């Protein structure tokens, strides 16, 4: 029942993207919490959240941010837990600023970075699931079933119908 | 002790980068295997490697490649294990090709992507350590020590 | 009657782009097949499709994908046939991720890469036609006529009409 | 034996790159010609070369250029033959200029584009080989051997 | 009366951009011609147009194209006249492909390149005007008046009105 | 009452962006002036504005421009005052041209550059405020209150409501 | 004299760049402190440093970092002081990563960003000087002299 | 003979690039002047230079600069003469900054922009020559000869 994944994001405007991570964890029956933590507007909130995450029982953090996207990296600075980063698509630079400011962590403090946007959010949840599945055989079986269904559900040919 | 992390790379030319991952895992006493597996030149080797990884006892795969870098993605396609991707710096485009071809995975098949180059290789090994630490207390304590020493070791001022 | 070109793509969403390759092969009376093969969701389907392509009588493969676009390159890993790659335009990065993940093949495994989007799909079909035309004189004549008409159909001046 | 592939490049400075195409064709015993043809400095040479390519017995043209790289595109404009384009690495922009000015052909006139640099030059020759192999069984068997040896030759682990 | 500037473009779709060059030459009373010449679909048309441009009395060529934009550069290969290049904005890459394929001419064959899009087209006409003005004092006076008016017409402050 | 910050921009079309700087200075009760100065169309206006800014009592200049964005840099060439640059988002290149042409000043003439677009304009005003606050204790207290409110106003969790 | 500018950088490897800021402040006789403070490796050091900067008498902070460069932004998050950011040139991406991760601050927390590299480090110190000059007449006169000498010193023609 | 082309550059560091423009004008016997004029460090020098260019008899200005490259644009702001812009290759961003800050002029004030680097400097001088040739028959014949020799001199095949 207690959360084992934390999904955090800098603002409400990130929710349109991060909701995909939430939905997938729920689908796979992974208890989690979903919070707003602003690296720039609530830096002490971030420090406290990241430094206590492990003792609160969290195993993985999924962090989403856009633009000068510092939330994943700074979270990783304060926790020993694996931190997964979702670059939120930005208006001008289409998430390239988000992507580079998350993935280009210097050696010593990792953030496992996923694709720009909704795909990245979904995949952050799947990656979290695959981490948790290493020690949780029921979840491993649910993930196997999920991946197997994804594969079996791919059609053989396109619907080539003109309109 | 049987390996719990697999480090794979497309070619010898990737080793200058991926050796940083190997060194870090060794420093933390994480049993691992370090292999060349080419998505493009040995696709069946890759398929076999990835599909049997879990049953062989691997927990995490770290995959490095450059250019049109397909090794991490395709590895992830064949395993349920977490796959971590290291973009190797390419000659012309400085690993931007490597980066985009690894990180931009469509929803459904993740690769946790690290920085271009040596930093990414080191961090993939650290990220793998932090994953393993979740269910290995002795390793968790060694990782805590590693992180603590990294933090404590930063000087207060630059030298000239 | 049996197909001599295979058009493959990762998903239905690629069809909006890849249909242009289909239309042009049909226009030039080139028998072909059109399939969905996902590099990431159906990797064994891909392996089987590519490794058997030659014995099934295929001469050219046209492969389209977007984002982390691995389908053309992995197809080329398993076939000795020429593989032509169409970068499908992606939402955030406008097909630059598609383009780099297709064209930047290391030495040893080629993918002949065309333009991002519909233009690339049309041109993949024309390039395939020009390959096939080398051994097929009827098709060579149809291609010559096609290219000649394209040239003769270019207007001499723009319609400069204000609106 | 009359050439069936033409390798053309805009200048001597492209040769460091395009020599990889020449070497590969020679390795596979594909008769070819290797020439300098500048889209910008010898545009009439280019026109003549491209328009007569087919009647001279050429089957594939491999064209290399850098910067505002127009040689492959314009070659394709004048021939019905398949034209393969090699972006040469440029000094400032590392072949991104070369790449975009070759690959982004409008619909109607294709250029099959390979990677920036030596890799692209090698792969253009391989792609040309795979085209020719469709109607030359002996060459198809040599290409099969080449691909098989590439695959079998990849080591299983890196050397230090 | 006879044209002294040639405006050329690859297709009708370029006219939305190149019309700005046409309008400005007309405004400055510069006789010119406006044509479609496709580098890729009518390469012999291009060769003939560029090689005869000087003897036909043209002094400047303004050439517009998008994507793999070869029309300005190839025009310059065949004429000794100054050639001005307008990168037409492309769909996927926003004219960056247009820009690089026009401006990055190797040493020996220049194209004077202007901004991506309508601004570039307007400025190609102004640059042409400034070239012609060197030998044409009536035009020099019209250009001076034009530039002077542009400067005098800039407002001192923005209209800060809320809506 | 007399202005201590100058907000300048190249054209009316920049106002949609620069208005955010104006609004924030007003919010913080910072007297300022807001003007159009075109680097390219009114270069002498710019020279006069920048060279007299200090003697007129200005302490900070906020300059906004897009495309080949020279207004901030040239302002800084003629004043000893701190100049803050706002890259206005451009149509084709999304403000990347704006950004590089403002931030990449060679050593010797600084422009403190903020984010592309509205965010940058808001932050140029906040940065100006933080500069002025160093010598103005009433303003320092208003800025502290503002920053404190920003921090306290961040919600703890997203509104996760489906629609 | 107590420092009124703080120069901070993530690591020794940044010093080759940030030394230009230090030299300029020294040239203008601006008391300052020059420190290593890592956003990623010493986040609590950063928090303390930034939150106490004002009460320690600092007026401006100049922060340099490369790659995923978070030091300036996070410094600004904890201080009301003006923070100036120097993108350090990174190996692979030449400071484009550094630049975007520093300049693209969301509204509410500014960082005044300078050019990638040594130029940016020098200009951050000049920009800090121009800020301090607003309420220090002696410094304003020294900055006027510095700017005047820069202008007067430019040669009229190049040397060969 | 009074100069009819002005070559200007922001600093000595631009000379390695702009010397190619100077050499070409000399080769074609085009009287010119070659000067350092900094948009940022000598803005009044620039204003004077550009505003008096025409009355001094200049016909074309070639302006080179790097980074946030404002010299060509601002020159064009003050003269009715055609201004040609040479993006100097910058250290970090390889002249992409230079290129965008020169070519992306808003409508109303043109700069005819050439390639990044030495090529652009050479081509700015050629473009200036082609402008002058319109009303100088002797020069037009020399330019014809130059272009003809360039074309005729291209080899037919590469050397090894």
Among the partner-chain residues H116, H157, H159, the one whose CB lies closest to the CB of D92 is H116
Provide the chain E residues 140-159 that lie in CB contact (below 8 A) with chain H: 140, 143-144, 147, 150
For A45-48, which contacts have Cβ atoms below 8 Å and span 24 or more sequence positions?
Answer: A45/F154, A46/A71, A46/A74, A46/A75, A46/A78, A47/A78, A47/G43, A47/G44, A47/G47
Please provide the DSSP assignment of A33-81 as one string. Answer: EEEE--TTT-HHHHHHHHHHTTTTT--EEEEEEESS--HHHHHHHH-SS
SS3 C163: coil
Q: How far apart are CA D28 and CA D17, in angstroms?
A: 18
E71 contact residues in C (CB cutoff 8 A): none
With a CB cutoff of 8 Å and minimum separation 6, the contacts of A149 are none
* DSSP code at position B90: P
> What are C146's two structure tokens?
């096609």
- Phi and psi at residue C137, in whole multiples of 5°? -65, -30
CB contact under 8 A, E108 and D41: yes
D117 contacts in B (CB within 8 Å)? 91-92
Chain B contact for A62 (CB, 8 A cutoff):
no
| Spatial separation of the C-alpha atoms in residues H130 and H121, rounded to whole Å | 14
CB contact under 8 A, C119 and D107: yes
Contact E9 C150 (CB under 8 A): no
Distance CA C4, CA C133 (A): 12
In this complex, is the C-beta atom of H108 within 8 Å of any C-beta atom belonging to chain E?
Answer: yes
Q: Which chain A positions have a beta carbon within 8 Å of C18's beta carbon?
A: 158
How crowded is the C-beta side of D76, counted as CA atoms within 13 Å? Answer: 32
G91–B89 CB contact, under 8 Å: yes
* Token reading at E148: 């002077």
What is the separation of C-alpha H147 from the centre of its chain, rounded to a whole number of angstroms?
18
Give the CA count within 13 Å in the CB-facing half-sphere of F45.
20
d(CA C135, CA C113): 22
Distance CA A5, CA G153 (A): 61
CA distances from C68 to A146, B120, C40, C85 (A): 22, 18, 10, 13
Residue of B9, B92, B121 to mutate when probing chain D, most D C-beta within 10 A: B92
B68 touches chain D (CB under 8 A): yes
Query: CB neighbours of D83 closer than 8 A, spacing ≥ 6?
Result: D60, D61, D62, D63, D72, D75, D76, D110, D111, D112
**From the CA atom positions of chain E, what is the Rg in Å?**
17
Q: Which residue of H has its CA nearest to E118?
A: H107
User: For residue A18, which residues of chain F lie inside 8 Å, CB to CB?
Assistant: 158
Say yes or no for a CB contact (<8 Å) between D104 and E68.
Answer: yes
Q: Inform me whether the C-beta atom of residue D22 falls under 8 Å from chain B C-beta atoms.
A: no
> Is A123 within 8 Å of B109 when comparing Cβ atoms?
yes
Question: How many Å apart are CA G140 and CA G146, to the nearest integer?
Answer: 10
- Two tokens, residue E47: 């060769």
Please judge whether B35 and D154 are an interchain contact, meaning their C-beta atoms are less than 8 angstroms apart: no
Please say whether the beta carbons of E85 and F82 come within 8 A: no
Which residues in chain H precede a discontinuity of more than 2.5 Å between C and N?
none
Cα(B22)–Cα(B24) distance, integer angstroms: 6
Which residues of chain E neighbour F36 with C-beta distances below 8 Å?
Answer: 154-158
- Other C-beta atoms within 10 Å of H13: how many? 13
Residue D114 to residue C112, Cβ atoms within 8 A? yes
CA H50 – CA F44 distance, rounded (Å) = 12
Fold observed for domain A1-163 = Rossmann fold (3.40.50)
Chains B vs D: touching, with 3+ CB pairs under 8 Å? yes
Residue H8, Cβ neighbours under 10 Å: how many?
29
**DSSP letter for each residue of E35-82:** EE--TTT-HHHHHHHHHHTTTTT--EEEEEEESS--HHHHHHHH-SS-
How many whole angstroms separate alpha carbon H90 and alpha carbon H98? 7
Helix (H) or strand (E) holding C34: strand C32-36
| DSSP H helical ranges for chain E | 15-27, 43-52, 71-78, 96-103, 118-133, 137-152
Q: What residue of C is the nearest CA neighbor of E43? A: C151
H115–chain D Cβ distance below 8 A for any pair: yes
The pair of structure tokens assigned to A133 is 């599945």
Virtual torsion, Cα D138, D142, D145, D151, nearest 10 deg:
-130
Size (chain D), residues: 160
Q: Which residues are CB-contacts of A57 (< 8 A; sequence separation ≥ 6)?
A: A2, A3, A4
- Taken in order B44, B49, B55, B56, the sign of the CA dihedral is positive
Beta bridge mates, A83: A61
Resolution in Å equals: 2.0
Instruction: Tell me the residues of chain C between 36 and 55 that have a Cβ less than 8 Å away from chain D.
Output: none
Half-sphere exposure of H48 (CA within 13 A, CB side): 6
End-to-end CA distance of chain D: 45
In sequence order, which residues have a C-beta less than 8 Å from that of residue E128 and are 6 or more positions away? Answer: E5, E21, E25, E30, E60, E62, E84
Q: Which of A92, A96, A121 to mutate to test the interface with F (most CBs of F within 10 A)?
A: A92
- Would you state the structure tokens that stand for residue G24, as one six-digit string? 């300029």
Spell out which residues of chain F touch residue E158, defining contact as CB-CB under 8 Å: 9, 12, 14-15, 18, 34-36
Q: How far apart are alpha carbons F45 and H123 in whole angstroms?
A: 33
Helix or strand run (H / E) with residue G71: helix G71-78
Chains near F (3 or more Cβ pairs under 8 Å): A, E, G, H
Contact assessment for residue H91 and residue E144, using Cβ atoms and an 8 Å cutoff: no
* D112–C114 CB contact, under 8 Å: yes
CA distance E95 to E113: 13
Correct CATH for H1-160 of 2.40.50.100, 3.40.50.1970, 3.40.50.300, 1.20.1260.10: 3.40.50.1970
- Best of D67, D158, D159, D160 to disrupt the B interface by mutation (most B CBs within 10 Å)? D158
- Which of C67, C74, C77 is the closest to B106 by Cβ? C67
Are E91 and E23 a contacting pair, CB within 8 Å?
A: no
Sign of the dihedral through C-alpha D56, D59, D64, D65: positive
Distance CA(B39)–CA(B10), nearest Å, equals 7
- Displacement of CA E25 from its chain's centroid (Å): 10
Say if A29 is an interface residue toward chain B (CB within 8 Å).
no
H12 interaction partners in chain G (CB closer than 8 Å): 155, 158-159
Q: Does G96 touch chain A (CB under 8 A)?
A: yes
Q: Give first-to-last CA distance, chain C, whole Å.
A: 49
Exposed (0-12), middle (13-18) or buried (19+): which is A62, by Cβ within 10 Å?
buried
With CB atoms and an 8 Å threshold, state whether A154 touches C36.
yes
Distance CA G64, CA G47 (A): 16
Which residue in G has a C-alpha nearest to residue H49's C-alpha?
G156
Residues 6 or more apart whose Cβ sits within 8 Å of residue F127: F84, F112, F114, G82, G110, G112
- How far does B137 lie from chain D, in Å, by closest CA? 31
Nearest to G33 by CA among G16, G48, G21: G21
Six-digit token pair at H34? 């070659």
Nearest to B68 among C39, C41, C102 (CB): C102
Helical residues (DSSP H) of chain B, grouped into ranges: 15-27, 43-52, 71-78, 96-103, 118-132, 137-153
Q: CB B69 to CB C101 under 8 A?
A: yes
Helix or strand (DSSP H, E) at D153: helix D137-153
Nearest to H143 by CA among H133, H135, H154: H133
Provide the shortest C-alpha distance from residue C5 to chain A (in Å).
15
| Alpha carbons B157 and H124: distance in angstroms, whole number | 48
- Read off the tokens for G124: 């951050």
Location of structure tokens 């682990």? D157
Q: How far is CA E109 from CA E47, H115, H129, in A?
A: 15, 11, 12
Taking residue D45's Cβ as centre, other Cβ atoms within 10 Å add up to 18
Contact H156 D68 (CB under 8 A): no
Nearest residue to H62 (alpha-carbon basis) of H22, H116, H29 = H22
Tell me the H-state helices in chain C.
Answer: 15-27, 43-52, 71-78, 96-103, 118-133, 137-152
H or E stretch covering D18 = helix D15-27
């Amino acid at each position: 029942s207690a959360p084992v994944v934390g999904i955090i994001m800098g603002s409400q405007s990130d929710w349109e993207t991060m909701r995909h991570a939430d939905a997938l964890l729920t689908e796979l029956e992974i208890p989690h919490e979903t919070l707003i933590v602003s690296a720039h507007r609530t830096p002490d909130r971030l420090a406290d959240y990241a430094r206590t995450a492990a003792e609160r029982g969290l195993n993985v953090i999924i962090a989403g941010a856009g633009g000068a996207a510092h939330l994943p990296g700074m979270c990783a600075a304060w926790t020993r837990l694996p931190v997964l980063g979702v670059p939120v698509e930005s208006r001008a630079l289409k998430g390239m600023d988000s992507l580079l400011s998350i993935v280009q962590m210097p050696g010593g403090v990792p953030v496992g970075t996923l694709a720009i946007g909704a795909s990245g959010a979904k995949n952050a949840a799947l990656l979290a699931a695959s981490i948790l599945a290493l020690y949780n055989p029921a979840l491993a079986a649910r993930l196997e079933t999920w991946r197997a269904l994804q594969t079996a559900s791919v059609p053989n040919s396109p619907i080539t119908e003109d309109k």
